[PDB]
Amino acid sequence: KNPKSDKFKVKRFHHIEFWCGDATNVARRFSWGLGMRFSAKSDLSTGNMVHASYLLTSGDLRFLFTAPYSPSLSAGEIKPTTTASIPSFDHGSCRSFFSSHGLGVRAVAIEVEDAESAFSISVANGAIPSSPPIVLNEAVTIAEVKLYGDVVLRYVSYKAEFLPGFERVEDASSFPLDYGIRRLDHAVGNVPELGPALTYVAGFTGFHQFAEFESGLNSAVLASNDEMVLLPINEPVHGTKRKSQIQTYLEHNEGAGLQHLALMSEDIFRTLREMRKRSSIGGFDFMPSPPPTYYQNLKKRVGDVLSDDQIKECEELGILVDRDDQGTLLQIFTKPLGDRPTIFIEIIQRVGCMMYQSGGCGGFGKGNFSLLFKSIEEYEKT
Amino acid sequence: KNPKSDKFKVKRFHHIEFWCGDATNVARRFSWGLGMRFSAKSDLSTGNMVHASYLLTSGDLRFLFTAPYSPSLSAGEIKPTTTASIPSFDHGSCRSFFSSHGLGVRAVAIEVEDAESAFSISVANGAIPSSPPIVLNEAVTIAEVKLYGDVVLRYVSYKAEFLPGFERVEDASSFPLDYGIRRLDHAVGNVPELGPALTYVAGFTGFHQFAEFESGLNSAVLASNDEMVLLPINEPVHGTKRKSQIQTYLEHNEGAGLQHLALMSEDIFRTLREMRKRSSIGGFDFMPSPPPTYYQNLKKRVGDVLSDDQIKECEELGILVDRDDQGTLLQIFTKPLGDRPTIFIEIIQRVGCMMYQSGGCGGFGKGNFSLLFKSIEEYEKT
Ligand SMILES: Cc1c(C(=O)C2=C(O)CCCC2=O)ccc2c1n(CC1CCOCC1)c(=O)n2C
Numbered sequence: 205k206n207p208k209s210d211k212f213k214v215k216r217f218h219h220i221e222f223w224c225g226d227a228t229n230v231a232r233r234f235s236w237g238l239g240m241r242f243s244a245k246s247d248l249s250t251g252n253m254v255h256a257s258y259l260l261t262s263g264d265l266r267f268l269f270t271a272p273y274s275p276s277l278s279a280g281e282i283k284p285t286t287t288a289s290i291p292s293f294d295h296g297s298c299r300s301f302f303s304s305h306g307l308g309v310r311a312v313a314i315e316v317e318d319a320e321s322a323f324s325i326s327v328a329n330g331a332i333p334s335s336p337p338i339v340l341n342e343a344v345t346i347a348e349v350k351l352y353g354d355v356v357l358r359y360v361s362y363k364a365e366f367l368p369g370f371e372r373v374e375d376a377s378s379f380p381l382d383y384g385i386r387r388l389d390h391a392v393g394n395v396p397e398l399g400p401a402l403t404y405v406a407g408f409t410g411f412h413q414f415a416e417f418e419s420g421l422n423s424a425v426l427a428s429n430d431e432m433v434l435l436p437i438n439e440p441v442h443g444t445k446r447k448s449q450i451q452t453y454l455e456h457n458e459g460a461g462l463q464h465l466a467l468m469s470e471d472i473f474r475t476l477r478e479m480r481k482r483s484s485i486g487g488f489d490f491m492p493s494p495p496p497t498y499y500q501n502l503k504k505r506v507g508d509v510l511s512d513d514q515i516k517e518c519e520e521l522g523i524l525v526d527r528d529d530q531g532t533l534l535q536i537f538t539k540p541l542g543d544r545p546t547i548f549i550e551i552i553q554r555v556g557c558m559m560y561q562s563g564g565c566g567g568f569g570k571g572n573f574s575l576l577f578k579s580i581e582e583y584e585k586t
Numbered sequence: 587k588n589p590k591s592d593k594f595k596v597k598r599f600h601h602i603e604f605w606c607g608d609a610t611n612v613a614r615r616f617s618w619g620l621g622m623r624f625s626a627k628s629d630l631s632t633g634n635m636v637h638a639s640y641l642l643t644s645g646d647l648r649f650l651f652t653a654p655y656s657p658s659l660s661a662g663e664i665k666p667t668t669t670a671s672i673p674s675f676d677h678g679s680c681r682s683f684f685s686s687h688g689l690g691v692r693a694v695a696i697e698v699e700d701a702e703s704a705f706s707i708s709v710a711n712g713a714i715p716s717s718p719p720i721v722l723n724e725a726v727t728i729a730e731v732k733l734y735g736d737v738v739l740r741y742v743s744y745k746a747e748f749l750p751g752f753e754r755v756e757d758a759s760s761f762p763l764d765y766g767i768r769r770l771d772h773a774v775g776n777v778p779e780l781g782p783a784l785t786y787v788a789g790f791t792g793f794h795q796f797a798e799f800e801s802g803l804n805s806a807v808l809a810s811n812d813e814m815v816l817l818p819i820n821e822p823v824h825g826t827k828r829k830s831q832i833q834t835y836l837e838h839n840e841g842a843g844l845q846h847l848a849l850m851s852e853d854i855f856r857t858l859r860e861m862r863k864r865s866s867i868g869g870f871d872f873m874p875s876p877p878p879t880y881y882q883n884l885k886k887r888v889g890d891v892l893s894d895d896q897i898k899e900c901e902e903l904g905i906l907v908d909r910d911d912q913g914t915l916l917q918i919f920t921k922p923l924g925d926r927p928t929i930f931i932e933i934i935q936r937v938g939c940m941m942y943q944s945g946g947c948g949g950f951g952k953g954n955f956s957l958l959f960k961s962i963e964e965y966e967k968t
Pocket residue numbers: 390392423424436449466491537538548550568569570572573576
């Protein structure tokens with residue numbers, strides 16, 4: 205059931221912003237590892253004396269990497285005279301964030317009809333304000349409220365090209381990499397207490413719970429009206445056999461924060477071929493693959509959806525497969541993106557639920573906990 | 587003239603350590619951009635609860651990338667019980683360094699006969715101590731004194747594999763990249779006042795001035811007995827037509843620090859081919875090339891050293907050429923390595939001064955200031 209209770213008009217995920225110590229090195233690493241093009245910048249060369257911000261794009265996916273300059277470059281500025289292109293940016297906040305959490309997501313940005321209205325309605329409905337609505341060049345409005353931990357939900361609305369003050373990138377510096385990634389499917393937070401986190405976010409958005417179907421977690425998914433903005437939240441389950449990965453996250457992250465970004469591919473086979481080729485030459489590593497018993501067991505579960513060759517391709521790439529009552533999910537997880545065992549990336553492709561494809565088709569793979577455990581002792585039984 | 591006045595036995599450059607906010611992303615970027623292999627690690631997976639440290643190697647060149655974890659992971663430790671593999675590491679120092687300077691070199695490490703003796707003699711001769719000698723697993727001794735700004739000169743001595751507590755890397759994660767870089771040729775600092783910086787460092791090392799042959803700088807080079815450890819220092823020259831690049835460095839870096847690392851290649855043509863192929867796909871960018879008049883003028887200057895084809899190869903790659911009374915230098919400069927216009931890399935190859943090749947053969951390229959200016963108006967004169 206979907207009561208379509210959004211308190212303001214929400215469109216799609218717009219961008220994800222990482223707060224970095226050095227935006228250049230993280231952006232270049234991510235560009236090569238994920239096949240994303242350098243498409244916009246705001247930095248010293250564009251007159252920004254406050255922060256360096258670099259935008260990578262792949263299809264509709266937008267990753268922004270931002271780091272602070274020395275405060276001395278802008279010590280004469282005040283907010284009315286700022287050269288920052290993102291007016292919510294604060295040197296102290298950014299340094300405190302990265303010192304506390306390491307490299308990670310500061311902002312989950314969604315595009316809305318009216319960011320000023322979204323901010324006002326959110327705050328009237330319990331949202332903790334983080335940065336008030338600000339109109340940029342009479343063309344774009346940005347506002348921010350707290351989501352969880354030090355992560356903010358950023359509202360962006362356009363009157364009618366990323367943000368004013370950003371410049372399109374050089375072409376020589378813009379190599380057209382593309383491994384098939386096309387959009388953000390969902391963005392997942394880890395918190396100590398799921399109940400109060402859900403109540404808070406659902407309280408100020410009107411997002412509804414997305415229906416599902418002990419591994420150390422309890423989770424729930426909040427969804428917009430058309431279920432294209434999907435914000436799952438996890439809490440740890442304590443006392444289990446193996447220590448909860450959610451608890452490890454909270455310890456190494458110094459509390460709640462964004463756990464994973466799931467990136468939809470239009471061809472997950474190509475994406476994983478291209479990413480795995482680059483794992484050991486600057487790109488991303490992937491978790492250890494399931495045993496061959498898992499891919500043996502795929503015939504009975506999804507043999508009506510994938511051929512033997514397509515299943516063999518999944519086995520070659522370490523891809524996981526789950527199924528809803530509506531659709532099928534192909535997914536795989538990277539190792540952590542940086543030094544800490546905190547944020548990682550999921551690559552996904554969904555098949556089914558054709559109307560366009562409806563959001564969340566096939567679920568989020570919670571069935572793969574049983575099937576992985578079921579595969580593990582099965583391969584031990586050889 | 588070389589008075590060979592070293593106050594302790596110095597061998598060669600040993601490693602360069604960058605202090606990072608996220609060591610993983612910088613190390614992976616540098617590995618791909620420079621063709622260096624991942625060869626050792628010290629991090630959570632090796633029992634280090636304090637810092638993540640990753641070592642890249644190319645030939646004898648060793649780049650170490652280090653970032654701090656949350657202090658909470660090690661809050662129960664004291665120095666006698668530390669799990670840090672580099673005992674001089676301090677969370678607060680590292681965070682303060684990166685917040686002040688951004689990504690940059692913390693340590694220039696040289697191998698010595700006896701790091702305890704080098705430390706004692708240095709401090710008795712005016713060196714400001716930074717970290718006292720500490721013996722690691724009864725096998726290696728490390729000590730540190732201040733060099734300039736927040737950069738330290740690190741002494742390392744071995745009784746008889748990088749450092750104890752580091753583990754050799756996985757092989758699957760160790761891709762054998764190699765673009766031809768083989769060793770560190772020199773490491774250059776920028777300071778506000780050259781005189782007092784030279785007096786200080788030469789005072790405690792016994793390093794002697796290396797002889798040379800207004801562009802915004804004055805410089806001088808300090809050298810070990812066999813002139814294989816070379817430590818140039820620059821100061822700005824104020825009031826010039828174009829603003830001094832040394833002054834821009836000092837402003838954006840928040841004071842003195844390491845300006846550039848010069849990396850010797852055994853085949854600078856191959857190195858630059860390989861690095862330029864990767865500039866726009868995660869690697870490093872190079873400064874704009876000199877005009878063709880520069881390569882025209884190369885025939886009269888070095889036509890006895892390089893063929894027309896070899897000169898044409900220099901022009902294809904943007905390589906600069908200078909000449910001493912003893913040797914010839916091929917060199918090129920990267921754009922800044924990170925967000926700030928501070929640290930950059932030089933790639934070099936030297937030809938001549940055969941005995942092995944003597945250190946500093948061909949100088950450091952100061953002649954290229956005249957020849958570049960001479961080339962610029964010449965190409966304007968077309
Ligand atoms: C995170 C995750 C998902 C997943 O994406 C997901 C959501 O989007 C919504 C909430 C429910 C959910 O579970 C699916 C299956 C998984 C899994 N993990 C955890 C590890 C995977 C790699 O290492 C880091 C964590 C695992 O073991 N299996 C088998």
